[PDB]
């Protein structure tokens, strides 16, 4: 309201490629979190339910980070068998 317009969440179009601007804009709002925040603000999320969701999202991150860290550590061993026949 009291801020200047056409600065925030504004993306300019290059060579009439509007699709790329909208994909770029939608990627800025998702990385910042506005998209999911706008979807969770449509209906009131009770504190107890919001605390149950934050824990699930934090435990999934931990697991997915370690699972990914092991996949990148063991991808060196995805080469051909050097002792083929033994």
């Amino acid at each position: 309201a009291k801020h200047l317009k056409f600065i925030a969440r504004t993306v300019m179009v290059q060579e009439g490629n509007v699709e790329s601007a909208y994909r770029t804009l939608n990627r800025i709002l998702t990385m910042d979190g506005l998209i999911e925040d706008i979807k969770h603000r449509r209906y009131y999320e009770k504190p107890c339910r919001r605390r149950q969701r934050e824990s699930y999202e934090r435990c999934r991150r931990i697991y997915n980070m370690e699972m990914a860290r092991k996949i990148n550590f063991l991808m060196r061993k995805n080469r051909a068998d050097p002792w083929q026949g033994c």
């Binding site: 056409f6 600065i7 504004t10 993306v11 300019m12 179009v13 290059q14 804009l25 449509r42």
Partner: protein, 137 residues
């Protein structure tokens, strides 16, 4: 020079012109992508209404208004009333995550209007008012 995605600040002087007009002078296309409707209103830089169109005004009813075909039709209808008033370049300010959020932008392009920028002005509170309770459907 290169191409930046950031809008040209008014104060600092630039060379980006559209039909001899600065970014500030370009008219604005306010799109309100709701869940069951999509309202479009084209205004000038001096807040003068040029065109208004919506799915309801195009002969859609109830659940046909919350579709991408009705939003596109309303964009074509708002791009035909503003093109008679000398509008070519517009600044889109979309408000809402509805179905006709991008479909109305395509309809404006199918009416002879050229989009130079896409602004998002979806109301996000820093907790303010309490929404309706979750539903069991």
């Amino acid at each position: 020079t290169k191409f930046s995605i950031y809008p040209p600040i008014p104060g600092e002087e630039s060379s980006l012109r559209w039909a001899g007009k600065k970014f500030e002078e370009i008219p604005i296309a306010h799109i309100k992508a709701s869940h069951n409707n999509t309202q479009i209103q084209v205004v000038s830089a001096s807040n003068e209404p040029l065109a208004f169109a919506s799915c309801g005004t195009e002969g859609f009813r109830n659940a046909k208004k919350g579709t991408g075909i009705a939003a596109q039709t309303a964009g074509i209808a708002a791009a035909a009333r503003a093109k008679q008033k000398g509008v070519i370049h517009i600044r889109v300010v979309v408000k809402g995550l509805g179905p006709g959020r991008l479909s109305a932008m395509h309809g404006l392009i199918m009416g002879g209007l050229e989009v130079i920028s896409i602004t998002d002005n979806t109301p996000i509170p820093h907790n303010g008012c309490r929404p309706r309770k979750a539903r069991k459907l």
